[PDB]
Design a binder for this molecule. Structure first.
Ligand SMILES: CC[C@H](c1ccc(C(=O)O)c(Oc2cccc(Cl)c2)c1OC)N1CCC[C@H](n2cc(C)c(=O)[nH]c2=O)C1
Ligand SMILES: CC[C@H](c1ccc(C(=O)O)c(Oc2cccc(Cl)c2)c1OC)N1CCC[C@H](n2cc(C)c(=O)[nH]c2=O)C1
Lengths: 196, 194
């Protein structure tokens, strides 16, 4: 089994990359694609609260992302791993670190301690970081100043997380055309998987 | 202003005591009594999720109690404290420490780290612990329920041993009129010294 997470800002080509990699991996592996809350009833109820939030306190929002994360992990991810599946997960702990910790200003270490409570040691086996520049990402989103700066800070946050901790992290150049980003991601995954 | 929390297992007469103490304190102080979620919409929605939980993972449950704690703190407690009020809160961080941390077995220090993210330094000024023996508590209320009850009491003892200065323990084995009186006097002594 393998728990593989995908990280990156918006405009990193993440949706295309996961879908195309899934289509190639299913030839050799029992693979699933997922994202939080991913159909888990409690997680879906949490998601409704977050999306209905009127200027929700950023720490309450972080705790709700973390509670949705745990429900998705325990009720969907772990049973799939037990079946021997390759789980392709769109966003996990690192999104809360980059978005809640860095971009929203809570503090990466405070958000880390919260999410370590949530995942209880279950870190991804492999994390694909779709490393897009802010300018390329901006163009992919189009195809506001506060939004542009928020997108910039998300990337700055990811840069901080990957520069500090790196072992499961595999950075893929997402400034390339998407066919190349798919090929580099697929090859990175196959290299990991074929080493058991 | 003062933020005073009330803690204890079931059977400690905690609800009755806080209600009576609050009714007496309103005569001399600008005071409110509340509990989580306490009407805050997001907290109420989180409460519904917890109550609807079918064998809910204990850490998800702890995170939801912590999210309800923050909403109630931010929208009710902090605005009242800024208005200079005495805030009486029935159950706070120590309830998550005793129940989720100790009794459910996640670990007090793990649950403390989670709750410190939720309260962001807003610990109670004073915590009233209604110290009921497991035997009196049992009587005031099967093997599993009695074992969980004893575990909560044991958890509260460990917490109070580690943070003696924040707690004031009231003998909850006495008749409730005495528990009310000792709790009231403990609070007044604290309020008249600040
Ligand atoms: C509004 C922010 C946005 C977003 C977009 C779509 C959904 C939606 O599902 O319709 C969404 O709701 C979610 C998603 C995941 C988990 C929950 Cl509980 C609610 C959402 O966050 C509220 N952004 C998009 C970029 C990534 C952001 N994000 C994601 C995760 C997983 C995290 O931990 N932190 C974070 O800020 C959310
Ligand atoms: C079933 C557990 C029970 C309890 C009783 C009544 C309510 C109810 O409101 O009807 C309740 O729901 C709540 C209460 C507070 C906050 C939320 Cl989000 C939900 C509840 O916990 C699910 N016990 C009773 C003993 C104390 C327990 N407790 C309380 C708090 C505040 C905590 O942090 N941890 C904990 O285990 C809950």
């Amino acid at each position: 089994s393998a728990f593989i997470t995908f990280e990156g800002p918006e405009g990193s080509g993440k949706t295309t990359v996961i879908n195309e990699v899934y289509h190639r991996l299913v030839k050799d592996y029992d693979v699933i694609m997922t994202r939080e809350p991913g159909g888990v009833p409690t997680g879906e109820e949490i998601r409704k609260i977050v999306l209905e939030g009127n200027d929700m306190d950023i720490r309450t929002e972080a705790m709700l992302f973390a509670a949705s994360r745990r429900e998705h992990l325990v009720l969907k991810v772990i049973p799939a791993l037990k079946e021997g599946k390759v789980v392709l997960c769109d966003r996990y702990i690192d999104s809360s670190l980059a978005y809640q910790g860095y971009a929203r200003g809570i503090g990466v270490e405070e958000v880390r301690a919260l999410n370590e409570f949530a995942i209880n040691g279950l870190y991804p086996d492999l994390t694909i970081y779709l490393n897009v520049s802010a300018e390329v990402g901006r163009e992919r989103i189009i195809k506001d100043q506060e939004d542009l700066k928020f997108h910039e800070k998300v990337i700055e946050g990811y840069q901080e997380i990957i520069h500090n901790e790196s072992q499961r992290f595999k950075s893929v150049n997402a400034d390339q055309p998407l066919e190349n980003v798919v090929e580099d991601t697929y090859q990175t995954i196959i290299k990991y998987l074929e080493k058991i």
